[PDB]
Design a protein around this ligand. Structure first.
Ligand SMILES: COC(=O)COc1cccc(CN)c1
Ligand SMILES: [Mn+2]
Ligand SMILES: [Mn+2]
Lengths: 137, 137
């Protein structure tokens, strides 16, 4: 059967600024770079940045809610979010509708998130503060 | 410090067919559902389906290369691909890289992939046959 995300591939319009964003600003590990892409890791996540002439820099009001959240500890969350803010990283959401999260944009407008907590922790929180019509299986 | 992918959220135009696709067709575990979304798991992956009227059913020619690959064993790959084909799931690309890959579309046109092989496997193949301009770190 299926088990896990094997990799996340993001189409990027300009490879160098995107590599810099994920490696330098977000601290991911850069393993390889070539004329049309890069491979990075973030813990167990395999991230591929793929140069794509079709990628557009997309304002957040023009894209749907599809987004990619990265895990961070409770101890590190606030200072990492504040560092992104001070670096001028654009945002896309302010209301914490799914727990402790910071919502920010990559250079192409990919919707990213820092989040503290696992699925199990979110289900437990939702039992007390459920989303409308929520059912647990 | 970021420690991995916390969750992947896909915006969906119709919640019921999307739940059917990820839970019943792809075999992911449904943990909760509410009026505007669902939480599923696939191995370590926390998947959120979020009902979003902004989501367009998007032909693959109209979206960029951003895509989401799920892990499957080599032994299970061909029968899972055949399951998707029996269900009528469209393919958006043929495999031309190392490691088995099946490139298929979700009901809203999200670009998905089944892939066999890790980052380490890809890096080893690339060391032997580097892509154009490839540098390792
Ligand atoms: C001269 O330009 C650079 O050095 C930019 O950084 C790269 C570093 C590694 C690989 C590539 C792609 N060949 C570019
Ligand atoms: Mn999220
Ligand atoms: Mn892929």
């Amino acid at each position: 059967m299926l088990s896990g995300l094997n990799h996340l591939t993001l189409a990027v319009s300009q490879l160098a600024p995107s590599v810099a964003f994920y490696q330098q600003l977000l601290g991911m590990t850069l393993h390889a770079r070539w004329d049309s892409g890069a491979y990075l890791s973030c813990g167990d996540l395999w991230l591929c940045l793929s140069l794509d002439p079709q990628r557009r820099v997309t304002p957040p009001e023009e894209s749907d809610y599809t987004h990619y959240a990265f895990s961070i500890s409770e101890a590190d969350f606030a200072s990492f979010a504040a560092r992104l803010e001070a670096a001028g990283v654009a945002v896309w959401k302010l209301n914490r509708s799914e727990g402790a999260s910071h919502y920010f944009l990559d250079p192409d407008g990919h919707k990213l998130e820092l989040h503290v907590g696992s699925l199990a922790q979110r289900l437990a929180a939702c039992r007390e503060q459920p989303y409308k019509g929520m059912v647990f299986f």
